[PDB]
Symmetry: D3
Subunit: 291 residues, 6 copies
């Protein structure tokens, strides 16, 4: 019962994803293809990374994650396929996902295949990895790949072979760590007692505001549920509220909530109202907090 979870920048407005899927079912007849999402900003490797980093612990062991934005499509570049180490514990407090005490995942149970353009930076950072290979074998990719469609040729197709049981180590040569491209992760800074980060994402479709300031960054500063915080955005739009577990703790609908989101990051919203949209708040805006 193999699964491929598929994240691309292909969109859902034409037959691009369906072409990849027909091939995935062709190669791995028993496969289930789960869409992650296909709407990411094209070529934004950092955004793509956020949609894939936390997936492992939610999926059955043995799942393959086919994850791709491929701006270098048609170049001599080749995908990397990696077996991760730990399916972390996560959340706004960390754990295995699921009912009861959650579903514990054995180590080395998930493979990602992606362009080697840094898309997997946070996956490897958070999960570690046991082995990594360049994807080059004509057994798992086209002999004559379509130049403009490497997301199909060098990700979807080889991902189906992996799901179909093709030995990972057979895809191509091992990659040394330095050969795996990484993006730079801007660190959360300290300015006096405040923490300076950025708005990492607008949380669609709610218009919640996510920062890159993490629960661990907060607890490093003696900040926990119930602390009166001031959070400034874009350096000028400021906000004040206690840190609360969830939206409704803000009281009335529309009231500001400052909370930790399901990924453990300091976030800000309105209670059952959109914060970001009325004010055109955006990813990339400076975000500063302080108790």
């Amino acid at each position: 019962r193999p699964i491929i979870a598929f994240m691309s920048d292909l969109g859902t407005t034409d037959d691009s994803v369906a072409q990849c899927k027909g091939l995935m079912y062709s190669i791995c007849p028993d496969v289930t293809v789960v869409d992650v999402c296909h709407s990411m900003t094209p070529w934004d490797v950092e955004e793509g990374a956020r949609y894939i980093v936390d997936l492992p612990r939610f999926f059955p062991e043995g799942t393959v994650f086919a994850t791709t934005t491929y701006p270098a499509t048609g170049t001599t570049t080749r995908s990397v396929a990696v077996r991760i180490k730990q399916a972390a514990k996560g959340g706004a407090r960390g754990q295995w996902a699921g009912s009861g005490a959650g579903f514990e995942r054995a180590e080395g149970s998930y493979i990602y295949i992606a362009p080697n353009n840094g898309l997997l930076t946070t996956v490897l950072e958070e999960h570690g990895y046991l082995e990594a290979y360049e994807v080059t074998s004509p057994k798992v990719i086209p002999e004559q790949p379509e130049p403009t469609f490497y997301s199909r040729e060098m990700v979807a197709i080889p991902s189906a072979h992996l799901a179909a049981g093709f030995p990972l180590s057979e895809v191509g040569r091992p990659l040394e760590d330095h050969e795996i491209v990484r993006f730079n992760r801007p660190a959360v800074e300290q300015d006096g007692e405040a923490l300076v980060g950025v708005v990492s994402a607008i949380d669609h479709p709610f218009g919640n505001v996510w920062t890159n300031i993490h629960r661990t960054d907060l607890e490093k500063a003696g900040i926990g549920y119930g602390a009166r915080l001031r959070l400034t955005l874009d350096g000028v739009l400021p906000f004040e509220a206690p840190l609360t577990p969830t939206f409704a703790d803000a009281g009335e609908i529309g009231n500001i909530a400052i909370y930790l989101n399901s990924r453990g990051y300091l976030s800000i919203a309105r209670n059952a109202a959109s914060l970001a949209y009325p004010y055109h708040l955006k990813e990339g805006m400076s975000a500063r907090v302080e108790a």
Copy 2:
């Protein structure tokens, strides 16, 4: 072959739906997850109810409907899981869906699991129910559920157990009828002999206009499939046309069609052209009809 049909307000721009599906496949290996939609206006329980109310007759018996907008996420609230009675009939008459005379559905063949926030209001009304339960057992939800993600913790996860055959009656204690939250549905009022309701929906992607004025309000009002009607929208925009069963009945492409949609409601459209978009017609605009 167990099915979960999944309707949420989570959107399709991030990994939120994938986290839920991952856990569904973890819990019910042989499951098939069918997306209903994930684009509903967040926290609009009335809109979400429209997308789920007439699902059962289209699905195989035993299908589990996981349906959720959860603005009370992270509070002491718990989901409700119900077995509905009649699978029923829809369109502008009431009947069974499918080829030939349609496929009859045995009573009690479908389970809905949703936040107890009135989302199931119209489902219970149209279908009735045989049993309803609070969803509390750590066999079917997390012992430590993520505060801001009850759509996953309190709907997606438990739905997967139900699809897998976990006894409904064991999810938690039984709920009395009064304990199941309902939303209020505004009635069609009378002014002279005109009926006065609202635009219940813009029917995307076509730009058709759906009213809350039902067949029954028309019938035993005098209006039948050939009546010249005057339909005024937003208190300003008047349209005139015979009541017809379909769009092409309007004749020329672009001509006004006033018809009954499949849910039996008075609707208005242009024939193979968009009515709503050019005039910027919107949900909630008043709608008035007279013969």
Copy 3:
């Protein structure tokens, strides 16, 4: 392990697609339903045609393509079901799809079902057909079809019967070629030394510009990779670049690339930036190429 690949104009904002899928699983329990896309401009049969013409080579043999925009829903019209001949080769070079040398697909191995409104024009033109039938039998359509929902009644339902192995030739009577509605598709005009055509699509979500000028058109003007081209859009934008296999060949990010897209068509783009969006280029603008 039957597959229905499903392309409609139903959108993804309500339960319309889900109703169709529920019925597909009801009729063909072992079915896999693969979404192609549901976001096409309603009633734009030429656009719908673009999303379906290239599908066959990507899917396992026996796949049924349920493809539909149905502005004549509720009339006496009936759908057409056709068995295609060639699952063609049609990409930038013209090859079978998949790893190695590709998956060669047998002839006569795919069925399309669609309104008989010309939606299948390019499918038949490119692939040919072995047999075609009007879809009328109450064994595969409803005796009392919902007037406004022929995409479900006259496509989704019968596609599931076909996928379950209901004999093609039993859906209804044979259609003569002339009874199969086609739309006209203008040729590329071999103007003097130039090839004259149109922008056929904006390639979402990248903003790439696709023309209807196919590689075969380029051949016979003797135009291949390396050729210094002038591609003039909208009559006033004389873009100049060599024809290259892919985006990165243009060098700097944002630089213009002229290339052959994965459908085999002459296209223009910027390297890892959007061409169409910033300058609001649109489908239907003139496209002229020359070396």
Copy 4:
């Protein structure tokens, strides 16, 4: 105390109008320059014509109207200067303007100067003319005119000489009527019992809708105040109201009024609310009236 009333397409965002005015004061020191408007759609001679045709009765005799959109700037074309005949009566009733019984204006008492491009079509049609001359003498235009600024060179400058009392007939040679370019203005079609025309303008900033159906058209169909009308816009909006003198007659704020505008034309509006803006009604949509 000479007056130039100045209507151009120059906008109010740069120094173009000021350059013209500086020159007007340089040439005719005692002049008063009255702005008509400068915001017309560039090169839309029919719109420009609407803003100037009704001016004469409002201004003191001897007023010079410098009116210009000049897309043929920098060519061999030269402007036309005309002395009109009747300063007409033309409002909802047809009267002289001002307190008491109005200011009766003598005949032959206003001069227009404009590009000879049809801008003056309705001026001549409504008022008649006594004499017309091509504007060529170096006494009133530059010997070396700025190619891209004929509105200044060939209108503003010569208008100031005219206002300073430079003899009309000395600007250049007499033009034969046929040498005076006119645009065609379609009539209201006396369709059966109805009068068929167009939306001629959206009345900014109120969003009122003006049609080209003049009170004289209404007369002779026997339509006057009190008449219950059906005014159908855009072919599909059958507005119904009595023809009333003014907006408030419609009763409640937002109620539809059908009236005669201050130019004498059949118009439709909402009482102290906007009709055109919310529903995006536009100039050029069909307009049909009938009682």
Copy 5:
């Protein structure tokens, strides 16, 4: 050297204002017509009032202010003409306007003429008045006024007669105070130590934010230049800064400035950047301050 300062909702996109002006020059040949503005939101008497209330002290004594939005155009209503008492001292601290110690204006030196719909509410409140008359005489208004153009018929025209020296008391009968329509002025409230008002206006074209909280309201609370204030808008977007005389006191470009505007009202801006526009701040938003 009479002056009429003219404020209307007529806009500047057609010949409406020019019609009024031609008549003003016709009636009062020596007049200068100064535009105040013509862009006000139609029928917003409160906004119109803000554009006229502070004008007197800037203008030569004897100036007539013709000020009009006329939603009741064509009804039996008639304008009011009033001679004000004091040309106040104003500003963010109050005074006569001009060089040196300013230009002191004698009492009873200005007349406003306007519809009697409350437009003059704040004029009379701030300036007092010496006498008021209904404008009804056929010596100063048309015998047959155009129904839809009372801003011309009942304001522009009579204003020119006043400028021309027609005795004010001759316009019509005296009006008692209760016959002069007033709008309700929402008071600035106190909530603990805070002051609650509203955003009274977005200050175009800068995007500065003006409140209805006045310098006197502030100094009633012991708040003066240099006080650290918290100002919340829309109940959620908060801001912190000392009260400073001007924008540049904020330091760096873009920094928040809280200041008193030239009309003496508590305002908020960014230093040489727009505050309102990036965040879509709007008039009507709650505004609260507190030291």
Copy 6:
């Protein structure tokens, strides 16, 4: 007959300009105020400079130019008032404006008064100056100027005294050249034989595109009035056409015209159609030209 020509960033939506004009008429009873424009992007000293630099030759001698964007309003800064030397010549050659051979202007015939913030940079460059003074005397500015309104206090008021004949040399102390702030103007650079500048302006309302590439840069570059040029905008959008003196030279309506505007700068337009608006071309986009 004294004239003030008035250019500001105050807009035309409130009473700001009227307050200034009121004081101008108070101080200089016989003055004529001519609006240049009031719509400039606030605080953009480069844009404001474009609207005032070529004014003098169009105006009668003795005209006072009051020109202001004042983001340093309320600081210790004071305005500068200068008498310019040559009135000069403009267009694409340099000459006098007006009928016949134009009207020559004696040297030293114009005074500008502006904030000392570089607004006059191009004025001084193009015209030279005979004398410059800091504006400080309480004879010409307020003793207590409103902090947020230096455009009125430090420009409008003093300009009116100057127009009235207040001796320039008495407004304050003389300024040395180095004390007059200038802005830096980016030069046209060379790449190969292409000239590389910027779009200096979108020429509203026509949508013409103005570059900072001047006649002189072209001349003594090889480019003359018949040269086939390639003009690339924003580094992407290419246009081709001969250099022509005007729009109609392009031939067909809509055709590309590359020309010199009146200020002598390389510009590009469509003939009697808008270039900028459909392609969303903007100020500041790079512009590159090659023969």
